[PDB]
Amino acid sequence: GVQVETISPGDGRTFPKRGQTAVVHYTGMLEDGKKFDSSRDRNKPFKFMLGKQEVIRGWEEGVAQMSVGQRAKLTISPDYAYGQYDENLVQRVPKDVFMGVDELQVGMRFLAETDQGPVPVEITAVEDDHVVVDGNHMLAGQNLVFDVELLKLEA
C-alpha cells in the first residue's frame, strides 16, 4: 500500500476530494533514494485532478490524507505505483524481425506492435540469435518514495 509520514504540517483542515485539482511540488525517488523525477527541477508545480487516475494509486490515496500546506513522505508499494514486474511483457525476438541496415542499440525505446496494442518497449539485450524486448514500465516492481508538498487545492 502507501504510507504517509509528515515532513512539515499543513492546516489540518482542507483535504482533497474527488474532482478537485491538487497542486503539488514533488520529488520521486527509488527505495534507495535515487531521484528519477522532480517538479522542483522544472520550477513548475504539478497539477492533477483527484480520482481521474492521472497519478498512481499511492498518490490518489496518499495525497488525499494530506491537508493544504503539508509536506509528506509517500512510501508506495509496486502494486500502488507502476505495478509488479510482468514477465509476459519480456520476450526474445529472433533478430530477423528487426530490419534496419544501421545500428540496433540496446536501450533503444520505441512503440512495438503487441497483442495489447502499440505500446513502448525497450531492447534490453541482444544475443547472437535473439533480441530481448521488454515492455515493462521502467519502474515496474519498484518500491517508490515521494517527497510531496500540497501547495494548493483548487476547483
Curated annotation (Swiss-Prot):
Superkingdom, taxonomy of origin: Eukaryota
GO biological process: 'de novo' protein folding; amyloid fibril formation; heart morphogenesis; heart trabecula formation; negative regulation of activin receptor signaling pathway; negative regulation of transforming growth factor beta receptor signaling pathway; positive regulation of canonical NF-kappaB signal transduction; protein folding
Modified residues (N6-succinyllysine): K52
Name of one Pfam family that matches: FKBP_C
UniProt membrane topology term: Peripheral membrane protein
E.C. code: 5.2.1.8
GO cellular component terms, A-Z: cytoplasm; cytoplasmic side of membrane; cytosol; membrane; ryanodine receptor complex; sarcoplasmic reticulum; sarcoplasmic reticulum membrane; terminal cisterna
Domain PPIase FKBP-type, chain residue ranges per copy: 19-154
Disulfide bonds: none
N6-acetyllysine PTM positions: K52
Gene Ontology MF terms: activin receptor binding; calcium channel regulator activity; FK506 binding; I-SMAD binding; macrolide binding; peptidyl-prolyl cis-trans isomerase activity; signaling receptor inhibitor activity; transforming growth factor beta receptor binding
Reactions it catalyzes: [protein]-peptidylproline (omega=180) = [protein]-peptidylproline (omega=0)
Stored InterPro entries: FKBP-type_PPIase, PPIase_dom_sf, PPIase_FKBP_dom
Annotated control of activity: Inhibited by both FK506 and rapamycin.
EC primary class: isomerase
Keyword annotations: Acetylation, Cytoplasm, Isomerase, Membrane, Rotamase, Sarcoplasmic reticulum
Subunit text: Interacts with TGFBR1; prevents TGFBR1 phosphorylation by TGFBR2 and stabilizes it in the inactive conformation. Interacts with ACVR1B and SMAD7. Identified in a complex composed of RYR1, PDE4D, PKA, FKBP1A and protein phosphatase 1 (PP1). Interacts directly with RYR2 and RYR3. Interacts with GLMN; rapamycin and FK506 abolish the interaction with GLMN in a dose dependent manner. Interacts directly with RYR1.
Role, per record: Keeps in an inactive conformation TGFBR1, the TGF-beta type I serine/threonine kinase receptor, preventing TGF-beta receptor activation in absence of ligand. Recruits SMAD7 to ACVR1B which prevents the association of SMAD2 and SMAD3 with the activin receptor complex, thereby blocking the activin signal. May modulate the RYR1 calcium channel activity. PPIases accelerate the folding of proteins. It catalyzes the cis-trans isomerization of proline imidic peptide bonds in oligopeptides.
Full protein name: Peptidyl-prolyl cis-trans isomerase FKBP1A
Organism whose genome encodes this protein: Homo sapiens (Human)
